[PDB]
Design a protein around this nucleic acid. Structure first.
Length: 57
DNA sequence: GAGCTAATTAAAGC
DNA sequence: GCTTTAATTAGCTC
């Protein structure tokens, strides 16, 4: 695929979620996606990569 | 059987 | 050329 870019707002809301939840139901993933104007796959992969980063730190 | 972690790959912006 | 990170893949597990 081609890489997605996120606005500063989207990144800040995605990282507010990761602060509370670190894992998401399939339903919450669709919620966040619709609120953020993102697709479900974009939210899913962001959360996967974020967890990898969070362990390394 | 979707969904998770790890290890990559390589595209994105400088 | 460099660093950060979105995306893919192989493997495991309930």
């Amino acid at each position: 695929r081609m890489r997605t870019a996120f606005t500063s707002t989207q990144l800040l809301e995605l990282e507010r979620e990761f602060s509370s939840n670190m894992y998401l139901s399939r339903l919450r993933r669709i919620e966040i996606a619709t609120y953020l104007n993102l697709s479900e796959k974009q939210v899913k992969i962001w959360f996967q990569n974020r967890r990898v980063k969070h362990k390394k730190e």
